[PDB]
Amino acid sequence: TLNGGITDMLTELANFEKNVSQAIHKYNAYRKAASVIAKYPHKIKSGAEAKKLPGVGTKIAEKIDEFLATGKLRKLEKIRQDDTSSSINFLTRVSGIGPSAARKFVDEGIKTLEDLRKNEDKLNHHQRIGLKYFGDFEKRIPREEMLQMQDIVLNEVKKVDSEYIATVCGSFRRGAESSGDMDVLLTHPSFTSESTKQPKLLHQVVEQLQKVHFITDTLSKGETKFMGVCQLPSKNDEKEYPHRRIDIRLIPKDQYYCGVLYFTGSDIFNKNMRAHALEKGFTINEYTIRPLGVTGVAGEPLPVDSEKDIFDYIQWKYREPKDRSE
DNA sequence: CCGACGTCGCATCAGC
DNA sequence: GCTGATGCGA
DNA sequence: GTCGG
Ligand SMILES: Nc1ccn([C@H]2C[C@H](O)[C@@H](COP(=O)(O)NP(=O)(O)OP(=O)(O)O)O2)c(=O)n1
Ligand SMILES: [Mg+2]
Ligand SMILES: [Mg+2]
Ligand code: NA
Ligand code: NA
C-alpha cells in the first residue's frame, strides 16, 4: 500500500478508457503503469521519479505530480461528474455488459440497477445472470472458502473419472488470502494435442457439479471452456453463502505446463511475459511456446517439461506463482 | 516520430 | 448452414 | 499512453 493513492488513480483512469472511451490500449497502458508502480518499493516523491519506471511516460508523470500536490486529479473529478460516463461505468460492472452494450442501454434510457431489473427481457443470457448475482459477484472469497470449494470440485471430478486431474489456478494458486473467483484447470489423458479419444469430457464434469448443486448457473459453455456460477452448501439455520463465479478450462494433458502458466496469471503478468517473449522472438499461448520465423509466422512448438522451461526460453529467471501477482 | 501493443474461447451477428 | 467479424471475458 | 527502432 506504499503508493495506493497513485495506483488507485491510474486504475480508475484505466477503467474509464476501457468502458467509456473504448480505448483498449490506453486501458492496458494505465494497467501496466499501475502495476509497475505497485511493486516499486519506495513511496513515490514525484512524477519524475515515477517516469523512470517502464510504462510510466510523460502524461502519467504529470498526473502523479498533480495527485501528490493536491491529493486528487481534476480529469478524474470531471469524469466522476459526467452522467454518461458514470452511467456507463456502473452498467459495465454487470458481467456480460461491456462498453458497447452499456452505451447502448444508456441510449435507451436504461442506466440504473432499477432500470436493469425491470428490463430483463433486453439482456442476453450472460447479462441476465450477471444482474441476478450483481451483489454476490462484488464479494471477495476468503481462502478458507476457496479451500472448501477446492475439496468439492476435486472430489466430484474424481467420482466421474479417476484419471481426471483438476488444478485450481488463478489468484488461489498464487497464494492469495482472498480471491475474486475460482479458476479450475482440467486435464484427462483422453484429450491431448494429438487426439480427442472421448467426447463430452468437460460436459461430464459440469453435469456432475450441477447434480450435487455446486454449479448453479451457466454463463457460457463450449468444448474446452466453461464459465458459470457456483455456491458452497450451508448448514442448518445458516445464512447461505454468496454465489461465486467459476471458470473451468479443459487443456490437452501434454500441454499442461503452458496451460497452468496461463491460468495462474496474473493477467498483467501474462501480458508482460508474452510481450517479453515477442522481444526474444517467441510467442506464448496457453498451449505452446513457439519460435517466430523472420517472416513473422510462428514455428513449431518447442519441448516443454515444466513451467520453468518456458521461462528459460525467453531468458527469464523462474518465478514461483506467489511472485506473479503483478 | 510512430507502428504496435498478449493471446485466445464462447456468444452473437452480418453477409452469402 | 458456413465463414468471418465483433463483443466480452479469461 | 508508452516506447523501441
Ligand atoms: N486479461 C487476462 C485475464 C485472464 N487471464 C487468464 C490468467 C488470469 O490470471 C487468469 C484468471 O482470471 P481471473 O480470475 O479474472 N484473474 P485472477 O484469477 O488472477 O484473480 P481474481 O480476480 O480471481 O482474484 O486467467 C489472462 O491471462 N489475462
Ligand atoms: Mg480468478
Ligand atoms: Mg476467473
Ligand atoms: Na518510463
Ligand atoms: Na461487464
Report which protein residue has its CA nearest ligand 1's atom 6.
A263
Q: Please check whether residue A264 is in contact with residue A183, taking contact to mean a CB–CB distance below 8 angstroms.
A: no
Residue A114 grid coordinates = 432499477
Ligand number with the minimum distance to the CA of A178:
1
Residues paired with A218 in a beta bridge = A228
PDB resolution in Å: 2.1
Residue A293 grid coordinates = 520465423
Residue A89 in contact with ligand 1 by CB distance below 6 A: no
**Rounded Cα distance, A6 and A37, in Å:** 8
3-class DSSP state for residue A171?
A: helix
Q: Please check whether residue A311 is in contact with residue A320, taking contact to mean a CB–CB distance below 8 angstroms.
A: no
- Residue A36 CA, ligand 1 centroid: distance in Å: 18
For residue A325, count CB atoms less than 10 angstroms from its CB and return exposed for 0-12, middle for 13-18, buried for 19 or more. Answer: middle
Task: Mention every residue, 6+ apart, whose C-beta is less than 8 A from residue A25.
Answer: none
Q: Please check whether residue A164 is in contact with residue A187, taking contact to mean a CB–CB distance below 8 angstroms.
A: yes
Residue A90 grid coordinates = 456502473
Q: Please check whether residue A16 is in contact with residue A79, taking contact to mean a CB–CB distance below 8 angstroms.
A: yes
Query: What sections of chain A are H helices per DSSP?
Result: 4-19, 24-38, 47-51, 58-70, 74-81, 83-91, 99-107, 113-117, 125-132, 143-160, 170-173, 201-211, 256-264, 267-279, 307-313
**Rounded Cα distance, A246 and A22, in Å:** 27
**Rounded Cα distance, A7 and A268, in Å:** 14
Please report, as a single letter, which amino acid is at residue A224: T
A173-195 b/e with 16+ CB inside 10 Å = b?
Answer: bbebeebebbbbbbbbeebeeee
Which nucleotides of strand C lie within 7 A of protein CB?
A: 6-10
Structural domains present in chain A: 3-82 (1.10.150.110), 83-139 (1.10.150.20), 140-262 (3.30.460.10), 263-325 (3.30.210.10)
User: Residue with CA nearest B6 C1'?
Assistant: A271
Q: Is A88 annotated as a binding residue?
A: no
Is there a cis peptide before residue A266, judged by omega within 30 degrees of 0?
A: yes
Q: Please check whether residue A157 is in contact with residue A164, taking contact to mean a CB–CB distance below 8 angstroms.
A: yes
3-class DSSP state for residue A298?
A: strand
Answer positive or negative: Cα dihedral of A18, A285, A188, A185.
negative
In 3D, which of A61, A69, A7, A5 has the Cα closest to residue A36?
Answer: A7
- Is the Cβ atom of A247 within 7 Å of strand C at any atom? yes
**Residue whose grid cell is 494505465:** A30
A12-34 b/e with 16+ CB inside 10 Å = b?
Answer: bbbbbbbbbeeeeeebbbbbbbb
At a 7 A CB cut-off, the residues bordering strand D are A 25-26, 28-30, 33, 51, 53-61, 279
Task: Mention every residue, 6+ apart, whose C-beta is less than 8 A from residue A297.
Answer: none
* Experimental method of this PDB entry: X-ray
